[model samples]
Target: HHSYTWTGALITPCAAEESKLPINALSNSLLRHHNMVYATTSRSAGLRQKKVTFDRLQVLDDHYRDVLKEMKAKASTVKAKLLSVEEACKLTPPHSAKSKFGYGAKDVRNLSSKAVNHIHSVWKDLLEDTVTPIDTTIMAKNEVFCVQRKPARLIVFPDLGVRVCEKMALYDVVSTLPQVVMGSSYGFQYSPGQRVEFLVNTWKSKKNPMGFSYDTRCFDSTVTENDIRVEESIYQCCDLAPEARQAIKSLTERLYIGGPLTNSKGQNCGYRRCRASGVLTTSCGNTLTCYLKASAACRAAKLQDCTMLVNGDDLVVICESAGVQEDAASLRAFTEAMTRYSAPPGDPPQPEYDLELITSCSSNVSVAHDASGKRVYYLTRDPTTPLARAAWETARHTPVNSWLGNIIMYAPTLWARMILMTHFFSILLAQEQLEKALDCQIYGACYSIEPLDLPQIIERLHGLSAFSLHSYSPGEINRVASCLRKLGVPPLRVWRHRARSVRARLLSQGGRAATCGKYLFNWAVKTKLKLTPIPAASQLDLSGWFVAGYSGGDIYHSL
Candidate 1:
């Protein structure tokens, strides 16, 4: 993935050991690029951090002010009411990080006196203190290799406590404002519908529109002091509470500016850093910096037919190609401009003549069959992480149910609908925890959606077209096969066969199962099962969920 570095260089003090996994595949396709995936710093570090020395900072200009004015106006029309403490507490997932002060997510959810009190105090301090830089807990997320799992590396996020408070104060503005400002150019704003539509448009927009993606090595580590200030300046443009403004400034100086690198041993790892992936502002700040730099890079290089799409640090540039040699030169020029902006390309920027050859957001475009025997286009990834998380979920509970969320997002995909949905729900059904709402991060917030409601959820989330879609492209299928072989997962055919028994059994159970079976596995039999209502629908509220382009009753973003 563009997000990780795979250079086989060592940075650690010792020979880093490989980590293990819970029967995973597909990772090998990506993991093979680097023989080892280390969890900590290393000298022979396969995941090497690029040296991006800070040279400058961003100053607010009229263009920035104009962007802010529009964002401020959008914030005025947000119509978002501050969530009540209990409401916010409920949004806390069953597996959220606990307060160091006292109590955990369970206590908060059940309204434990200690938990509630602590949460309230934290919120109050968030509203009142406005100056305390919240301390963040940092860790190397364990990774998986081909057959062997490996320890992690890099200065990733310190998923912190008052971080929730920061999200609470600004989610409404942050979530909606950038989409308004950047429009279709904003990457986060696209839903499946918008995404598919945007892709279709962009792909067809030009006759010879060469497209490419650029990965910035160590993106978080590359941000300078000025980047944070510029982001703060943009954030301040939004009409925010005085407390919110103060908190923003304090966070900028504190966590965002790079705090003491606290290791598990409680010693300073000793470092200089800029952006930590674990912050609330990471998306907004990175997106802002990335867009600003890329937009400027395109202009400076004097390229015609360059339209940029940026999601955080993942960038896509499609401009008019002036033949292969010229396009290659343009790419070199593009890289030069980006390096000038303090964002150097990890790989020499690749310029592809076709959009399908392009990969962004860890996903690529592939075609499938719809109910009417028509072609359908949808986004899909290698399913390595989904398999990894699924194996992890089968054995344990986690803060994020990435598998379930992927099923929701990629419901139309033959892999997601048949494999992920079947594997997870089967486990949930067995555990009798189907009705218990597990927290899933959608967009950038916590959502508690019951697994049993997935049928209706997918029905609306992906459209009924998802149920009837079948027959994936061989290229996509080959990747799936490779993933299954490497990760030790069963193939799509096996998943389909499993879905039959899984479907028939659900039909016998009645209620929600009948609907899930009906919608999720409609292709199983000649007679279509009638869809039914979800009993848990009343308790579920996707009211403020993530959906692209001002829609109601759906999620706004995928977390």
Candidate 2:
């Protein structure tokens, strides 16, 4: 057995204390409902379950059904009248004659349309059944409260809208399957082929995106205002230095940084300029002039001619300043180490000299490593070299002529996975080809192949120049031949035609005469490659070419 309790407070004018009034009111109601219904103990073995049986449930079901039917009837009448009123308003005139004269005419028409749609929408919503309170009561002190039970069942009748949207019924079936399985796991079962209808209700409705509401104001009035105040205080405390204040003032004046300065001049002379000129220029000026003179002197020196400004002493000073002394010292140490390593194996060298030699040798080894790192060695003598061996092995394993095979082997597998996911590889390929063709058009390469027939026939009345072929044919070869023949107005030595089955080969003369003759041959070969005939339906007539058709009617129909 279960016991449920509900307590409510009452506020009323009384000579007694406020706390005593709530106790008196609750006691009176508690005696009426709780004491009358559940005060006595069960007299029989099955008496507890019989107290809330199907007979009592049936009475409640019938009551709610009657209420729902009445509500639906009222809703239907109101909705029909709303639509009628709206239609009448659409035919009515504006309130003022002046309102009908200009933009007000359109505005009035829109207002009428909106009002009709709004009333109709609201009336339609009222047509749905409302869930009513199960029990409502007022206590002795006049405080009111109600209890509502869960809806046991819902019924829906077929309508014109449902019939029109029959295909969408499958989604309803799919959505409810999971819901039934979830309910069954919690010991609640539903019948097969049952229609589970949810109530057309919401605990809270969403406001419009642009609408102002009381709840939204609380956020701005409390949270956001506090945040802004805290942020402003932080800025004042930590970021109000003279420079920062100037930056803030600049920010307030403009959203972005101001334009470039027109009158400002940076440092024009310095010690660096004076020192650069002392070494690089005979005539003292600025560092830029000295740099320009030095560049010219270097160019002249490359050509084996020394300039006056780049004399021996000046060159020495320039080299010293540019860290060329360290570079020369490094080179001298490298040469000495190389000479020592190249000497005969038998040696009793001093320990100091050996230490110096090893230090120098290590520096040279580091330099060699640095230089070797930059060079891409396709072949190498040392198999133990890390990067070189790895690169060499990769090249050795790769097939020289098969790029597609290498891509399939080494490229990421995600490309194939994506193609499989969408099953659109062919469509993607077609789109790529179309983009390539569009690019060709943009670059003025608009020459395109037209559908054609095979075994192109030539008419005698028109010479090769006047000959015309159908746009759909293997006549491109004849055109190419004609163009080549025009190039060779003075025809040369030999001409041979070899024809077998569906294949044909043409050849011409050799030797000095074949100098330009080879060009015609190549042109024929290129033409053959570009203009091969696709299979024809018939040898004589091309009727089966009409295999596909698109759109509604022929172009001539509109014409």
TM-scores for all candidates: the values are: 0.79, 0.10
lDDT of 1 by residue, 152-209 (tens): 4453334324544555555555666566556677877776555666766786787778
Backbone collision count in every prediction?
38, 4
Q: What C-alpha lDDT values do all the predictions have? A: 0.62, 0.18
Each prediction's Cα RMSD? 6.4, 42.3
Would you give me the overall lDDT of model 1?
Answer: 0.62
lDDT of 2 at 287: 15
Tens digits of per-residue lDDT for model 2, 108-221: 334454444443343233233122111111111211111111111111111112111111211122112212212221101111001010000110111111100001111101
**Would you list the clashing residue pairs of candidate 2?**
451-472, 452-472, 452-473, 453-473
At residue 85, candidate 2 shows an lDDT of 34
- Worst ten-residue run, lDDT, model 1? 550-559
Largest lDDT belongs to which candidate? Answer: 1
Q: lDDT at 427 for candidate 1?
A: 63
